[PDB]
């Protein structure tokens, strides 16, 4: 049983910030997603391009596992064809997306007494992100015609802001850990396949 190492993705002690989202390519393994789908521990498990029952029956060239942390009300933006600060400037999904978005609450692990400011997001960006694009630039945002010259100002801002993530912040401003599984189907031999249906 060469099981897919989903667990190091999901059970990583620390998770990325959304702007600097993490990606792990997964391949040459057997993937039982059905045990993952029927878990109340996941508050979101949405599949696009495929059906949750057929996931064990399908074979894919590669699987990509993107993980980050966002707040609850922003998880809606992680679907295809969504708009918002997170979808426009941090993490964008294709309209043809094939895979599953998974998310669970992480307040016990990702909250601190003053509220954890380690998790950051991109508030301003000159253009909307392409699908699966990552941008970790900390260059100063020139909204005005003023030459910013790397100086924070009235029409010049720093691009990355921070979440509160107070333990008492309430659902929808609490931290949620997201894992996006995208299924790569190329004209090449399959390497990630569902469990053998001999059962």
């Amino acid at each position, epitope marked *: 049983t060469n099981l897919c190492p989903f667990g190091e993705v999901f059970n990583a002690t620390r998770f990325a910030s959304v702007y600097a989202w993490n990606r792990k390519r997964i391949s040459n393994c057997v993937a039982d997603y059905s045990v993952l789908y029927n878990s109340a521990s996941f508050s979101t498990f949405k599949c696009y*391009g495929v059906s949750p029952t*057929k996931l064990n029956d*399908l074979c894919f060239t590669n699987v990509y596992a993107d993980s980050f942390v966002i707040r609850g009300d922003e998880v809606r933006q992680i679907a295809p064809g969504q708009t918002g600060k997170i979808a426009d400037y941090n993490y964008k999904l294709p309209d043809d997306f094939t895979g599953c978005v998974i998310a669970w609450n992480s307040n016990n692990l990702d909250s601190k007494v003053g509220g954890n400011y380690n998790y950051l997001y991109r508030l301003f960006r000159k253009s909307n992100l392409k699908p699966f694009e990552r941008d970790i630039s900390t260059e100063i945002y020139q909204a005005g015609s003023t030459p910013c010259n790397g100086v924070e100002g009235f029409n010049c801002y720093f691009p990355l802001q921070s979440y509160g993530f107070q333990p008492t912040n309430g659902v929808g401003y609490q931290p949620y850990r997201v894992v996006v599984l995208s299924f790569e*189907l190329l*004209h*090449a*031999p*399959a390497t990630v396949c569902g469990p*053998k*249906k001999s059962t």
Partner: antibody
Amino acid sequence: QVQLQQSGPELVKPGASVKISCKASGYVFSTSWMSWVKQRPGEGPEWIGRIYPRDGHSSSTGKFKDKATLTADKSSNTAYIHLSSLTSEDSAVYFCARDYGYYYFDYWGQGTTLTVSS
Amino acid sequence: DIQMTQSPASLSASVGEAVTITCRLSENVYSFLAWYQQKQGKSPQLLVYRAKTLAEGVPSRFSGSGSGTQFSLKINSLQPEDFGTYYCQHHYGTPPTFGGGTKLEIKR
């Protein structure tokens, strides 16, 4: 480049067995699956099963679970299908196809015609 | 087993003409549909996979569209060598099933 040469036509008495072969070239025999398809005259094709030559695992449909067994020799890069208890309904054209795993078939054998005749 | 249904069963058209054939499925397969051409005494030959992806060596004249339960194949201008039986086949898990075909004749 990619070629799959199947064995010649076969006449077989009812109730017997037969082994049809498919010799592959132009690609890693072990990374890809080999699917087998039955076609009767006047009909569409019918998927039988596939074999993964690296670990030797085979999958088939219910109907063909007992008629057909699938084997793969990595030394000669040859995929085999063995059909047993041959009836007239079994007589058909049998194609080997290359399956990358996705269940579509980009490269096909030339077919082998199986005549089951007294 | 998903069950599949092509229309027309049969079709005649002249060179340079544009043709659309259709496939209809019991179940939502999303995008996992393939198209083949077949000729007498010969194997089927892949034309389209994943509803849109054209296979290698396949003329630009061939085009696949559709999704879910409804799919279509178009030839923008017919050529004298495009006669044959056209099969659709989902590739959405076991078992892969085919259609009953569409017989294309060239009108002349």
